[PDB]
Design a protein around this ligand. Structure first.
Ligand SMILES: *[C@@H]1O[C@H](CO)[C@@H](O[C@@H]2O[C@H](CO)[C@@H](O[C@@H]3O[C@H](CO)[C@@H](O)[C@H](O)[C@@H]3O)[C@H](O)[C@H]2NC(C)=O)[C@H](O)[C@H]1NC(C)=O
Ligand SMILES: *[C@@H]1O[C@H](CO)[C@@H](O[C@@H]2O[C@H](CO)[C@@H](O[C@@H]3O[C@H](CO)[C@@H](O)[C@H](O)[C@@H]3O)[C@H](O)[C@H]2NC(C)=O)[C@H](O)[C@H]1NC(C)=O
Ligand SMILES: *[C@@H]1O[C@H](CO)[C@@H](O[C@@H]2O[C@H](CO)[C@@H](O[C@@H]3O[C@H](CO)[C@@H](O)[C@H](O)[C@@H]3O)[C@H](O)[C@H]2NC(C)=O)[C@H](O)[C@H]1NC(C)=O
Ligand SMILES: Cc1cc(C)n2c(NC3CCCCC3)c(-c3ccnc(Cl)c3)nc2n1
Ligand SMILES: Cc1cc(C)n2c(NC3CCCCC3)c(-c3ccnc(Cl)c3)nc2n1
Ligand SMILES: Cc1cc(C)n2c(NC3CCCCC3)c(-c3ccnc(Cl)c3)nc2n1
Ligand SMILES: CC(=O)N[C@@H]1[C@@H](O)[C@H](O)[C@@H](CO)O[C@H]1O
Ligand SMILES: *[C@@H]1O[C@H](CO)[C@@H](O)[C@H](O)[C@H]1NC(C)=O
Ligand SMILES: *[C@@H]1O[C@H](CO)[C@@H](O)[C@H](O)[C@H]1NC(C)=O
Ligand SMILES: *[C@@H]1O[C@H](CO)[C@@H](O)[C@H](O)[C@H]1NC(C)=O
Ligand SMILES: *[C@@H]1O[C@H](CO)[C@@H](O)[C@H](O)[C@H]1NC(C)=O
Ligand SMILES: *[C@@H]1O[C@H](CO)[C@@H](O)[C@H](O)[C@H]1NC(C)=O
Ligand SMILES: *[C@@H]1O[C@H](CO)[C@@H](O)[C@H](O)[C@H]1NC(C)=O
Ligand SMILES: *[C@@H]1O[C@H](CO)[C@@H](O)[C@H](O)[C@H]1NC(C)=O
Ligand SMILES: *[C@@H]1O[C@H](CO)[C@@H](O)[C@H](O)[C@H]1NC(C)=O
Lengths: 318, 172, 172, 318, 172, 318
């Protein structure tokens, strides 16, 4: 009268999961596969970070008085804020998004002089909208202007040749006056025309005076143009008036990554996935926080939770 | 499961088993006793850890920005970007929902098969000396003490010793 | 299936069964009789309905136009749009063809397992009183009338009542 | 001598499906998972629909004589036909696709006056190509001529300031004459130039007379330009000749959806998936009708049929 | 496998079997003998060939160029193209890794099921005449020569001829 | 005392594969599902191939002296090399990528005369940068020039009408001189302006002299513009100077495919998947060679090998 039996274990309360042919099956254990938590800071240890403040990314090429300490920077991570501006005199760039995308991964810039010299005309044109200790202008460009009121501007030509083994970046500007009298007061009567030439580039520009709404107390405008130079070529400028001449050329170095954020910076932390609210640190394959994260991040799904079974089916007593 | 052992002819589990997933329970003239098994638990745990190692890991590919959230971009290209991102999100949402259900379905069947194999091995070990009863236990037809149960639990049971007495008890 | 019951040792099905998926068929001195079972049919139907509810539903995402069919758009962007659409179509065509075959494979194995479990339960209920023949039928070694068959159908069958007569018939 | 047996059911003829390791397995049931039928009408009940006829979508901003009843409309569904046109005088818009995409989801427009006034010059320029009861022009713009043939056009300026709490839409036009003689007859001899300015916008335009092919009996052309205005800003126009001045500004309201179709409209229906041939009503996850449907639609696949099993394997008698 | 036959109660395979996947091995007074089976091998081979035919085939959709590798294109569109291509590559890399493991898991279970089915079929025709031993083979309780083995192999064994002698040998 | 046993076969050395819950399971067979081999040649049998050498794809419309034998070609496969150039006088096209994409699938071109005639002015302008047996120009365009040094260029108009049942392709050019004296020498003093008109097109152009870097010994430039014509319309050119006139119009025929490669051509072969290094011939569903292949190709994955089991688990003796 002897007996032996076989059986398995069970637990008081289990977890509900989904299978191929039912929803809500109870098991002993389960785990989670979707991430929902973050850190409200920028984790950066082991990399060089540059935190631009009031300076815009595109200002570092021209140098308004608010970008005086970022003229030649080196970094592995670049952070841009919402209050950054890149102009001291009213105006805007042309094809700005491509330039921003180029600069976000440059890893820094290096400046080299050009060597242009001028005779006869003036050079020290200044305005009251860009003040350092008085009236000043951009730190890397020159406002040519004329010898005196209502004078003649000789037609001139200038040239520059690249020498190093990497492409260079060239930037210049055109000035649109606020009326038809200021143009004749600053560059004399007649017609004005500029032309830019290179091996794979040829363009012409002509000003257009007129009255506009007042921004920063001014009515004129400035337009900025840029080009990229192969490392054996030559660039030629031919001009007669309304020219903002460059003074230095920029070269890239290395590579990096850039983000836009609005939180502070922590130097005792580690991460590789960033978004506009902090850092995501996890090993799970899916996330449900943001769809525009950058770096090495898990994929984005629209579900809130997905449980994975880790035990047998639960059959409690009684 | 589709093997019909867990939640099948075994009515319920035991909440007193705390050192394994499967085990024995014996009752003889002296008293009751309980123990646990090692091989099946190891197999199930190994399968679970293999699945966990296979699943938990993230990618190695790096992505960057293509639009701006401070100043907007031209409409005709932003529309295309938004359309593409929304198209990708659906595929990535569908894949996970399929995969999780797949694995959840597989695990329970694995556990059921392990329990059935453990039952069948013990049934084969005791030949023409014990009788089934239908609820997961066997009834022995001879006198078996603690040492005999211990020998049964670790594959050292010789059926030739008790054959004649068990046969005589069963036939009459 | 991979359980070897349907299209296995059961040669063919019955076209006269119209109130279930599985059933019994008995023959004694009085005559023949037929019935049907309830639990296995319910399990199979529940699984099928669960799959149908899981599958049949559409998305909750809205898409709009990005091109025109009355006046064309610039070529360099239309080419990109066409390329992206053609890329997505292939993925969405592959997924469905995988999923349908998956479910079709699973269903038949489920049905086969249900039939095998139904056979095994009845085999275990009749111990040492009936003999297998290899075609899905059992041969009884005592006298069983309609009430005994009805008891066999719905459990509550006591094997101790007929043990001695069945054993004496079988041994000689 | 008693016997009991077990078995399963079967049917005379079944359906063929595909499994992981065979093609053509026979079962008792199967169902379909791909949709192939539609309704040859635009089903729309519970929403406000506007059915533009000969009017083009872009015409509702300028108001040719064929869009007189759609100047201020409200709708939730917008339908465009193949015969729609948006010009009464030869010309075309600039950057039209973006404007069309903006307007398709606007949900309607609302008009507000500007308040410009002119002195000296004429205002009632009319042509014979836009006839209402004689010779007329666009209903929402003005054609500024000169006082008399071969006269002087004073250089003038105008300004407008947004006041409401939503962006506004501004549209103007430039006229390219068919010959130099016509230009000197309508605006006098000399040079002509216009300029448009705002906070985030500055451009200049100049006409260019010439001879072209005759469309609608005319040789000149008109170009339309547009811009969007923030809810504090100011727009300034400075001009001397060849100007088509605006008269009203447009504001959006709500949101909606737009389609292109060629069938009729049914008001006793319900649907959310539209294409150029009717409506798709189904719950199946896949479709094989069109790849450019809009709304909430099933996904498009290139296969014609895919069956799903609903029963066990069929083993008929004998 | 999850049926517990291959690498289960059968310790190892035979390297001398060169004309099949499954077979018999018999020993009697005359000597030893070996043969092979046909049905199970055919079933396994058919399943493998079906999988191979299903898998090995390429698409018929045509794609063209959208960029240039001699002279570059504008940056803002090249970035979008690169982003889209990198997005698609991940999906196509994930799908194959899932599918291969799926099929590898299925095949071994299929083979194990075939072995178990053959074992059960052989077991079900020697009723009350042979006894199991637990290592995959049976002991016969009467005198069986080569012809009797041959009849066992090709399903022509009558259990009524030897029943009395086998029962008398087994009971005592 | 008889015994019968059952078993299965085994092999001495097996292959390792991956399953759902383990890595490195040993089996009797496995096969490969990823392709890694190619043929370092261009397999082309049963199709007509054209192998452009020094000639660029865009040159076949204008006809520099290096594209004299490809003026009217017919092919099913087009191959471009790295050394191809499409200019004999310094200059560049406008919207070149779209034109290249159009031409890559044209399948060939057919030329038809236009019939323009001129009176008074000269026609035989030639340069030393495009030499056939002396000084020459493009083979399908005409350099107008003036009667003599410092003369007058009458204002002229020309027109052309399409007649066939397919769209046509029209190409013209504008010349930017190297200085302000050469423009006067070649076309006389004053202002210059050209205008192009059609049903759905109206543009104006004006030259811009200036000094640039020397390419091929020249300082001037030439810009090429193109348009597509519907099969009932009319094109009108009105010009006064600095014009390069077309002479013939092009029509497409059939369809084809184009690739860029750097290997030789084999005529006894067959394939449908090409890349810049040869041909891919396989039936496997995946490949790991290149991600920019064209034709009917397997899909690209980043893994190097993926094995598929073809047998049972291997359990060797002892
Ligand atoms: C493509 O999708 C993105 C969303 O991922 C669209 O950007 C989102 O646009 C809405 C509508 O303006 C923004 O909401 C509003 O933003 C303003 C500005 O911050 C705020 O003041 C309002 O209270 C409201 O939140 C939303 O922020 C913005 N999301 C971003 C910038 O991440 C985008 O518009 C879509 N593309 C096109 C062409 O519409
Ligand atoms: C991108 O793919 C679409 C197809 O989804 C291409 O549009 C299709 O282009 C063909 C070729 O012209 C059209 O066929 C012809 O259309 C004309 C005009 O209606 C008709 O008269 C002819 O009898 C013939 O059917 C086809 O209709 C059109 N499909 C549309 C507009 O839905 C498109 O061309 C592709 N993109 C590029 C840049 O090629
Ligand atoms: C989009 O991705 C492609 C890659 O599929 C990028 O093209 C690749 O760019 C790199 C960087 O210049 C090229 O490498 C370099 O090529 C030059 C030319 O021979 C060589 O001298 C250098 O030593 C270096 O190997 C690479 O060849 C090129 N791949 C191509 C053209 O197939 C492309 O730049 C990316 N898009 C953007 C906007 O960056
Ligand atoms: C075209 C299509 C078809 C189906 C069947 N879809 C499902 N159902 C799941 C059923 C089980 C297999 C995975 C998909 C979803 C879905 C489901 C749950 N949550 C979300 Cl967010 C989405 N989206 C689907 N899209
Ligand atoms: C990269 C790739 C790989 C395979 C195996 N592919 C198949 N075969 C099916 C085999 C079973 C699993 C789904 C795919 C198809 C395919 C086959 C038939 N009809 C269509 Cl519409 C598509 N397209 C595939 N693409
Ligand atoms: C978002 C995501 C999630 C997972 C789990 N992923 C895996 N692991 C495999 C685990 C088993 C199922 C297929 C995927 C990979 C992966 C794996 C191997 N090789 C490469 Cl190149 C990639 N990429 C994944 N991406
Ligand atoms: C079939 C055909 O050639 N029809 C044309 C017609 O389209 C055109 O309007 C007319 C005059 O322009 O000449 C004729
Ligand atoms: C469930 O899994 C977690 C993860 O290891 C573990 O901590 C926990 O102990 C498990 N559940 C039980 C009841 O042990
Ligand atoms: C640049 O051009 C000169 C003259 O053509 C040549 O000698 C030189 O090798 C080229 N490259 C560099 C890097 O100077
Ligand atoms: C099995 O258990 C018994 C307990 O009586 C013990 O004597 C025997 O040594 C055990 N077998 C092995 C292999 O350890
Ligand atoms: C089973 O059927 C028999 C028929 O004789 C009946 O007496 C018995 O009550 C039934 N059992 C139950 C639980 O209803
Ligand atoms: C198959 O399923 C359909 C769907 O409801 C049902 O109408 C039909 O009756 C089923 N087949 C049979 C033979 O009943
Ligand atoms: C608009 O500008 C005025 C003056 O700068 C300012 O007072 C006001 O707050 C701004 N916003 C609105 C909604 O008026
Ligand atoms: C089976 O084998 C036996 C060998 O003894 C032979 O006599 C018999 O004919 C065989 N049966 C069939 C159907 O081949
Ligand atoms: C494994 O499969 C290959 C493919 O046909 C075959 O050539 C080989 O013979 C198989 N292995 C053995 C041991 O036969």
């Amino acid at each position: 009268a002897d007996k032996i039996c076989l059986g398995h274990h069970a637990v008081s309360n289990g977890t509900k999961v989904n299978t191929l042919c039912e929803r809500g099956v109870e098991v002993v254990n389960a785990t989670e596969t979707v991430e929902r938590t973050n850190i409200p800071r920028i984790c950066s240890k082991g990399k060089r970070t540059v935190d631009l403040g009031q300076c815009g990314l595109l200002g570092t090429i021209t140098g308004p008085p608010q970008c005086d300490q970022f003229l030649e920077f080196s970094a592995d991570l670049i952070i841009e804020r919402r209050e950054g501006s890149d102009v001291c005199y009213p105006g805007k760039f042309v094809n700005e998004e491509a330039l921003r995308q180029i600069l976000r991964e440059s890893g820094g810039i290096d400046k080299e002089a050009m060597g242009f010299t001028y005779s006869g005309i003036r050079t020290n044109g200044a305005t009251s909208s860009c003040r350092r200790s008085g009236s000043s202008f951009y730190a890397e460009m020159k406002w040519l202007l004329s010898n005196t009121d209502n004078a003649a501007f000789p037609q001139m030509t200038k040239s520059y040749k690249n020498t190093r083994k990497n492409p260079a970046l060239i930037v210049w500007g055109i000035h649109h006056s606020g009326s038809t009298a200021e143009q004749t007061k600053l560059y004399g009567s007649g017609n004005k025309l500029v032309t830019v030439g290179s091996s794979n580039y040829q363009q012409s520009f002509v000003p257009s005076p007129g009255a506009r709404t007042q921004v920063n107390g001014q009515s004129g405008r400035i337009d900025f143009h840029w080009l990229m130079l192969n490392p054996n070529d030559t660039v030629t400028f031919s001009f007669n008036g309304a020219f903002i001449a460059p003074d230095r050329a920029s070269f890239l170095r290395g590579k990096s990554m850039g983000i836009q954020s609005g939180v502070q910076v922590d130097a005792d932390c580690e991460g590789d996935c960033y978004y506009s609210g902090g850092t995501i640190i996890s090993n799970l394959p899916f996330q449900n926080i943001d769809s525009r994260a950058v770096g090495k991040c898990p994929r984005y799904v629209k579900q809130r939770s997905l449980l994975l079974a880790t035990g047998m089916k639960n059959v409690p007593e009684i | 499961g589709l093997f019909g052992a867990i939640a099948g002819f075994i009515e319920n589990g035991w909440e007193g088993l705390i050192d394994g997933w499967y085990g024995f329970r014996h009752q003889n003239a002296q008293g009751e006793g309980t123990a646990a098994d090692y091989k099946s638990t190891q197999s199930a745990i190994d399968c679970i850890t293999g699945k966990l190692n296979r699943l938990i890991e993230k990618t190695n590919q790096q992505f960057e920005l293509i639009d701006n959230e401070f100043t907007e971009v031209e409409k005709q290209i932003g529309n295309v970007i938004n359309w593409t991102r929304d198209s990708i999100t659906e595929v990535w949402s569908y894949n996970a929902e399929l995969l999780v259900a797949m694995e959840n379905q597989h695990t329970i069947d694995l556990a059921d098969s392990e329990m059935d194999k453990l039952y069948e091995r013990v049934k084969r070990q005791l030949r023409e000396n014990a009788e089934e009863d239908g609820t997961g236990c066997f009834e022995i037809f001879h006198k078996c003490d603690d040492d005999c149960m211990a020998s049964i639990r670790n594959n050292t049971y010789d059926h030739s010793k008790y054959r004649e007495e068990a046969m005589q008890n069963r036939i009459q």
